[PDB]
């Protein structure tokens, strides 16, 4: 009755905000990883989220996560293994869910676009691994904002040159041939196969503001 | 005659604990430091007014659509005169039209509910250069937090229909999807307009993501695909 | 045993990111600098306050009329008379009795609303000298904040009567008389009691404003100057 | 091509007074000194936050008893066995059970509740040490601040049932006391589990506190001591 | 519905103090001017608000007031003559409206009370050039504000002695024979026609606290 | 109507608590007294109270109490007598009350559980005269809070031997016996019947954090 009315509506979301500063207010240099929620632990894709992990936490920052399993997992796990500090974020969805065993400093937002905000403003660059609609969502949410300016020294880096490369082509091929985003845009984002180029770009890059 | 009691709300002041000044001159004359207003903290109150002018200017609005698309699309375009008719569509269904406020494709639409003479609302964001609300726009806000933003667009629409667009469109095209896969939204029909301009997206969607796991084949059938203004406009009202 | 998981909330908290005291021992022990009381987004903070209580202390009002006139006011004068005679007018046409819990003309209504067995309202506001609220109060606060009071004598009442006044009473006459020009307000009558009294300002408002276009003749005729208090009791309550 | 012009809200700025930098990125990029997480302004938000939490899970729960007593009760206890017997009877008694979420007599209320297949509810307590809620908790929260949670032990439940219990117990028992003494709580039954165990404890508040006049005989009718669950049951019906 | 209620009531009126607070936290000293919103530009009144609007940024002070035309436009234009800081705080009205073009930093608010109030936190003085209704409002709010101690050093200026006369006439002759006001409350408020010497008034008697 | 719901009682409640943090954040140190309401004005415990209070504000501490009659005026009294800060936080209740006379800054709260936290996070000790139901309420509150290390450095002082022996025999005799309670637990109150004794136990184990 009174919970589905905007005045209660307010009250709950602020509150998620607070809890949300609150928590994270004395984060260290982040640096947000997103990824499949799928990728299997046998997987090299999952190594690479561990070796990317780890090397970011070598490289200052702290990483931050979905609080999800599979590549979200695979970076918090490697950042406990760098001994650095791991955060997930969670959404609180319809089926039954926890944070990943990796994760050392977590919260559950009921709200997805007090939870995004999260995920911008305690980082200063995002790695993206190979991944599904969740992860396309956050890497085209990134890329309007540093294209129009609502962050600044803002790395966005693709790990997986193969995976990403039929997107990369139809964002030239189509988007910017068609002069739906120009070609100073393409280069917001580097693609690369390589964990220590990933680390480098998104060192040189982010933050130091 | 300055006081021996004081009953100023909840609080009673006694002899001693009585004030020298009024709690009003404190506040009307008092300029202070002012570091407060570059905090965090406060910041978190301007959002939540932000929230709280938003529900309150939107508050009347009947079931909505909300529409995205290239802001750069020219007006003699054959996309443009897509969004108009979509606009109307959208209208004659029964619809409000919720779009960014931008030109090109959105105002394009806000034209289009326009010409039907519905409910046309510009969602502005704050922008590093010069750019007001479409002349088109109807009930009109703009808003300076993106993710306040992001969540009207939600909250106020049942189903979304996007032109061909750039980064932007992508942005919440994609939002959309993962709201609907992850079940946090239910009932709410994504459709893309233009199988020539959004072909290739959906192609390596199939062909890569669907293909290595990251998907499933009926995460495609979340959107449809279509060239009809009338088809578009059937399937948001079927499924809304 | 110090946790190696803390659940607090939404909180998850494990290993080295477990915190050494709890969350209540740094809110109940800590007395830290006090610098934020005196500033203004606590100030805020109090303002809204004093907002929710008066909301709270009034929510079960009936319909009323808020009453001025001069504090200074001899309790054997014939306006003072005229004050008890139209605050029992209002309570027997259906009205409560709103006014700013002072002495003189707020007393002598707020008297009278009780002699007819109505609900008496005083609204006080901290003064820089020692005075209570009046002993013809019943519902009674002791406001802070001047605007936050304001409001309230508009928000739960329906007309103003006003009874020969200084400063104060000309601050509300003005204020509800361009809340009506403006039409933020309407059917809100305003009603001044005292025709020698309120006639010299009557003349200088036409004489002076109305006849150098700062006001039009229309304009003064949003209130009536009267000096029989059952007039002003059926004006109130035909246009209330 | 920066603005001449911008609307952001319902703020205008023009010519100089147009900022350089966006509202958004100034939000998204500066960290600042952070003070203020550790201030009583802020505590005062979290707070808040924690009642919001609060209400919001415990909207839809029905009409509960809050059930209370030793966190060391061993698990093959006559104590413990009382409390499964009395979790089911209020269960069929159409309660729902809320307990401290903890050990003991808590987690026997709670067991009973859910071997009636009723609604289980626990709220927890930071602890210095590990705890999490007990196994049979079906509604669950894990609160950070002692007087939130005082609050929701009374607002969602008609009655008291304590099982024999420490400090804690003692501390809820006497809370309700005084609020059913004072009359700020009201058809509030109290029942005690144990006439053995509570038997020093009545005997000293007559014997010492009404025979000195520091309480009422008619005060210790504010409860009754039982060892019959069944008995505990009908009455908390009864008054409830 | 829930729009008519008062937790809706609060939520709005506090989030436009917020408003008013944030964007004028920063302002310098300032005076608030009043005046007739049907002033026309040919005419002198309207010439002695530019006049009055440019000496009192010469004078250090920011220039407040409601955002309309006729002598609120004029002493805004004046404030921007003069290079100064010009504000308007409108009230939103059934009409359509939209704040005068001499205004470079302006609000609009829903309530009456929150405006009332914000022009004399974020002012030290008042000034009043000849006007309506509306004008009389502010006048008489100030000057109770004075009296009663809740703004110091807080100085109150009339602009134009034949226009303002009659009522002074009328304060003095009506309301202080009456004792409803003292001889000294007539003190409160200055009359003059010089736009130097309401300027000057102002200068002496606001601020520096 | 809007009243009973709760997006109005977090705005009732949070109000609350800004009126008690702004009213108190500058209080002096302070122990909060505890008593029974009935005590009569000619008796020794009343004696007591008034020697209590003396006492507390010659240790340096301001004096906090409910601010209604018997123990805890004198208390209140005691703490003006030797010019100390006297403080009263009311709970408002069906009957008509008030603030006892000798209580120079109070407040009234209408939400039982927030006058409750102000005793306890504007003191640091509580003082316990012979007392009722409410008096036995604080104290075992006052117990759990510092054996489950929520306030820290809390001296709890019962007046009276042989008023509260009954109670302690009960608590050693029962409760600690059948393992409810653990013999340091008991430890964790004094018991005497001196002023000055109780005056430096407090002085002794409060504060100075």
């Known amino acids: 009755d ?5 005045p209660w509506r307010v009250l709950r979301i602020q509150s998620e905000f607070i ?3 609150g928590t994270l207010a004395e984060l260290p ?3 947000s990883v997103f990824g499949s929620a799928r990728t299997p632990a046998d997987s090299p894709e999952y190594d690479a989220g561990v070796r990317l992990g780890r090397g970011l936490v070598e490289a200052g920052f702290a990483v931050i996560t979905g609080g999800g399993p599979g590549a979200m997992e695979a970076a918090n796990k490697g950042a406990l293994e760098a001994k650095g500090t791991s955060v997930g974020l969670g959404i609180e969805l319809p089926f039954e869910q926890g944070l990943n065993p990796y994760v050392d400093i977590g919260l559950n937002f009921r709200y997805f676009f007090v939870r995004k905000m999260m995920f911008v403003k305690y980082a200063q660059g995002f790695v993206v691994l190979p991944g599904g609609l969740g992860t396309l969502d956050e890497l085209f949410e990134a890329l309007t904002l540093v294209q129009t300016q609502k962050v600044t020294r803002f790395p966005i880096v693709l790990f997986g040159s193969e995976y990403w ?3 990369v082509d139809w964002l030239r091929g189509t988007l ?3 002069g739906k985003a120009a070609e100073k845009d393409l280069m917001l984002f580097h693609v690369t196969d390589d964990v220590d180029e990933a680390v480098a770009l998104v060192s040189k890059e982010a933050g130091r503001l």
Do not use: M
């Not at 009174?2 to 905007?6: I, Y």
């Open 2 to 6: 009174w919970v589905h009315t905007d």
């Open 19 to 21: 809890e949300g500063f």
């Open 29 to 31: 240099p982040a640096i």
């Open 165 to 167: 490369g039929g997107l």
């Open 176 to 178: 910017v041939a068609q």
